[PDB]
Design a binder for these strands. Structure first.
Lengths: 70, 49, 124, 98
RNA sequence: AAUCCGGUUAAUAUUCCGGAACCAGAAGGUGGAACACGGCAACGUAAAUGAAGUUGGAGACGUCGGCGGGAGCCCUGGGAAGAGUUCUCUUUUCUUUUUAACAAACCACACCCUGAAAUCGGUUUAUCCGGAGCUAGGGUAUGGUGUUUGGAAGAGUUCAGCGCCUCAUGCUGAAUCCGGUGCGCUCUCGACGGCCUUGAAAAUCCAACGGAAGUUUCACAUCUGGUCGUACUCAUAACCGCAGCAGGUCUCCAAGGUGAGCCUCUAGUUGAUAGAACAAUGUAGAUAAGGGAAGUCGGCAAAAUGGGAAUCGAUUCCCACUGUCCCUAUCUACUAUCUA
């Protein structure tokens, strides 16, 4: 499991064909955890703002399967 | 033990089948003296060796 | 009837000991019918089988009744004397030339308490 | 700072103990620093309405202590077998039947 | 060479399920890479050709002692939930309060650079280092470490409520927090100090020298991993003793208190034909008035708590002690008695 901090790279892993599913987690500190399942590693991204949480959600490609709070 | 070889297991397998009760229909045949088992073993009794 | 297997399963699903497993005495019929672990968990949820709570070692009287190596004293005393003598170097109270002598005496157990080492600093 | 509220709606409905009786019992048995009625300004007990008893304390106040104090009155009233104290939420207590 | 967590069965779990990883081998495609550079240096990087031949290291290793670190257990405070106590005092008493493999970054014994020391300095718990470079400053590297996160709360756990003829067994709220302490127990690590007997083998992997020929030792992705064992007991009943034999057996984990013993917590048993009555005898124990070895080949055994002086552990003596004895009596358990 890798922790990814750069937003764009998480987009480019998502656009990679190896990506299969992504999980959205709502933590008690109002952090949302984008957990992208890949072949070898589970890439997680913690973004602090609720609105960057949202514009990220539909910027994910529609083919990838997003999942609500796990 | 829990580390037996295949040959040991196979020998155990048929030794477990040998000491089974005889079907009744073979007894019910005519001219068949077989009416019981004289090769019945028990684990606590005589060892397979 | 017979409830050996039901008690064994009850302990298995409750993750406790079968001594602590409590099985209701006037629902024997329903408990006996409950044979698989799914049925046993059903009994757990309905409360027919309850896990008895733990006992206590009563630290209360243990506290009530509650209320030396020769090397360990030097083990910590040498630490405090050295760890104080080291900061006096950085504080500038004693130069390195005199500290070398002072640290050499401190091995010889010239002082027995930290205040005793302080009187030497006051003398010098 | 902290707010501790013990609801008395069930007790009022069942006529087991009035809010005035609960307030009087709290005043006469508040062992704050070992002295009854020594709450002062750090802790203030102000029952809002005849359905609950609320205490706002600027110092430490144990919910377990409040539950124990409430259970003390239940033993005197001999109604312990009829009602038990539960914690609906943090800093909140209530009495419910069996 | 390489796997952990949770759950599942009437019976299997590091094997099954869900999730998250690792190792080895094999080829390619895309992108970046170009017989490469930056740091005076202790070095470093996504890459940074290496045919043959030559070479070394890891693997590959005794025993004791102290020190410091970590992990788990134990102790403990504040808080939270549940249970016990109550006229009185007790913000009480008891139970529970968890974070795996695997990843990422950060983060001090050895070395180097500036420095050139004595006025000898630094400095180990345990006096060693240094003209073979001291102190100091700055870096270098192995970085279990924790410093945060992923795993991961969605898990597990403790509560409260609801869903309803009902295989309705799901649904909803919370909490699972903040610390302290160690000559404590177990496991383990590192710098050291001793005892010197200086302490196996291979595969595999790695590295260096080497100099024939004018885009991998990078990242991602893909495929595969055959075979056999896996239940159960490991014993006052599953092995061996003819036997469900008071015996014999290799080994891991091991809480608390009072202070080696006793009582318990978790866990596990209540197992061994039983009932009635205390005859004689016997076994096992204790107490005994006054005397104190008078017993016996003899202080055998108990009591003094065993001990004082002599002679060669033994002997003797004086003191001391006592049911050995005068002189037996009493009490308890078992057996014997009766019964199924």
């Amino acid at each position: 499991p890798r922790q990814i901090s750069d937003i764009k790279q998480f987009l480019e892993i998502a656009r990679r064909k190896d990506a299969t599913s992504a999980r959205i987690k709502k933590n008690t500190n109002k952090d949302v955890k984008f957990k992208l399942r890949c072949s070898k590693y589970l890439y997680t991204l913690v973004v602090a703002d609720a609105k960057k949480a949202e514009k990220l959600r539909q910027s994910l490609p529609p083919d990838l399967t997003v999942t609500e709070v796990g | 033990p829990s580390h037996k070889s295949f040959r040991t297991k196979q020998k155990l397998a048929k030794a477990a089948r040998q000491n089974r009760p005889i079907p009744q229909w073979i007894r019910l045949r005519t001219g068949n003296t077989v009416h019981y088992n004289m090769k019945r073993r028990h684990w606590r009794r005589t060892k397979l060796n | 009837a017979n409830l050996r297997t039901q008690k064994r399963l009850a302990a298995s699903v409750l993750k406790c000991g079968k001594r602590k497993v409590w099985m209701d005495p006037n629902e024997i019929s329903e408990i006996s019918n409950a044979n698989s672990r799914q049925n046993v968990r059903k009994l757990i949820k309905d409360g027919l089988v309850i896990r008895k709570p733990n006992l206590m070692h009563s630290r209360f009287r243990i506290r009530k009744t509650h209320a030396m190596p020769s090397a360990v004293v030097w083990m910590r005393r040498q630490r405090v004397l050295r760890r104080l003598l080291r900061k006096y170097r950085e504080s500038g109270k004693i130069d390195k030339h005199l500290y070398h002598t002072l640290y050499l005496e401190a091995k010889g157990n010239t002082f027995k308490h930290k205040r005793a080492l302080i009187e030497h600093i006051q003398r010098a | 700072s902290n707010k501790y509220i013990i609801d008395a709606t069930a007790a009022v409905n069942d006529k087991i103990f009035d809010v005035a009786a609960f307030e009087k019992y709290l005043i006469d048995r508040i062992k704050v620093d070992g002295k009854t009625g020594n709450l002062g300004s750090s802790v203030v007990v102000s029952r809002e309405g005849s359905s609950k008893i609320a205490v706002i304390a600027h110092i430490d106040f144990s919910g377990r202590y409040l539950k124990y104090l409430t259970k003390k009155f239940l033993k005197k009233h001999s109604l312990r077998d009829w009602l038990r104290v539960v914690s609906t939420k943090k800093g909140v207590y209530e009495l419910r039947y069996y």
